[PDB]
Design a protein around this ligand. Structure first.
Ligand SMILES: [K+]
Ligand code: NA
Lengths: 202, 207
């Protein structure tokens, strides 16, 4: 399956980790969006929104990182790995995925993409507080086992770590993060993508 | 099923329409965020993020409008109604839901919440509608040829734009789709009611 991507991006790194966890091979096609490579007509035919990540899986084109992630698990995941069958448990996972996009990652973008006001820094703190509460009394963000929601939020929180946002006062988040780093497949490739992204801005 | 909401909100109205499509009664609990009612400790205990909509279904508290919508369909939907089983068709629906949140509704929020908004933010709306128009090329619905939760969520958003007097008549697939959506989507009447207070409210504040 073809994976149109940039290695530093959080959405791209989420899919990378999910694919590694599922033991799936990605044929990586680096599209430099800083050089408008995502506007090539061959790519636009696959994804008319011409966004990355985009995965092409035997003729099937899908984009939005969190949609890709859930698709790979629903198609290739064995048993209840990373995603259960239960509507209730699945709903919590889905709410955490929208949290990750609309609240947690959104606060990252608002504060670091103007590379940032005190107000937007407060927005990050507020988001981390919610995540900390989400993690009260459980090892993972949506329950008792690693899910796609953990992997997505790891992608985001590791971006914060490398950008040097200090979340050490968030006891649950810090404990979750250390565990997630050890148990999540593909962390090494997440870290590589982050490290270049850091060396980039640095 | 307790439904914590405001009638004007796009996310609240998505849930209202899905609940109607599914035959589900909501016990509506109006939670007015302009008076911090959602910050009250009793609500925070139900939803630590204290956002609306929040659904409490027989002890289970769930929030994020699009998560609530999918939960209702997965738990209560018959057959393949509103959400087919096929991982591929479900994936396209999920992509359209994230589109709705992060691109389409996002462009509404950035332009209209101040109302300033800037010309760049207006352009972002046009860009978002352009993509939606392309998604609808040759297609009756946003994610295939049946009504889905993605249509209902995007209908909530596009109807918000209409009542805010954004002209999308130049997007002819979106316009066609919208006119059809209004006729075939359950709960349209309640969505409109939520919008029209919104208009009347906005109009009166403008003087
Ligand atoms: K690599
Ligand atoms: Na994408």
């Amino acid at each position: 399956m073809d994976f149109y991507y940039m290695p530093g991006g959080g959405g791209c790194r989420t899919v990378i980790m999910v694919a590694k966890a599922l033991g799936l091979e990605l044929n990586k096609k680096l599209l430099n969006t800083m050089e408008g490579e995502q506007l090539k007509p061959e790519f636009v035919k696959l994804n008319p929104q011409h966004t990355i990540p985009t995965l092409v899986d035997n003729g099937f084109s899908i984009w939005e990182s969190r949609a890709i992630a859930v698709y790979l698990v629903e198609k290739y995941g064995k048993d209840d790995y990373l995603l259960p069958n239960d509507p209730k448990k699945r709903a919590v996972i889905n709410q955490r995925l929208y949290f990750d996009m609309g609240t947690l990652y959104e606060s990252f973008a608002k504060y670091y993409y103007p590379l940032g006001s005190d107000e937007d820094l407060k927005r990050i703190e507020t988001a981390f507080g919610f995540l900390d509460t989400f993690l009260e009394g459980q090892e993972y963000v949506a329950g008792d086992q690693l899910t796609v929601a953990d992997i997505a939020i790891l992608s985001t929180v590791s971006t914060f770590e490398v950008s040097e946002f200090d979340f050490s006062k968030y006891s649950n988040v810090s404990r979750w993060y250390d565990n997630a780093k050890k148990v999540t497949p593909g962390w090494d490739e997440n870290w590589e993508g982050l490290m270049a992204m850091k060396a980039l801005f640095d």
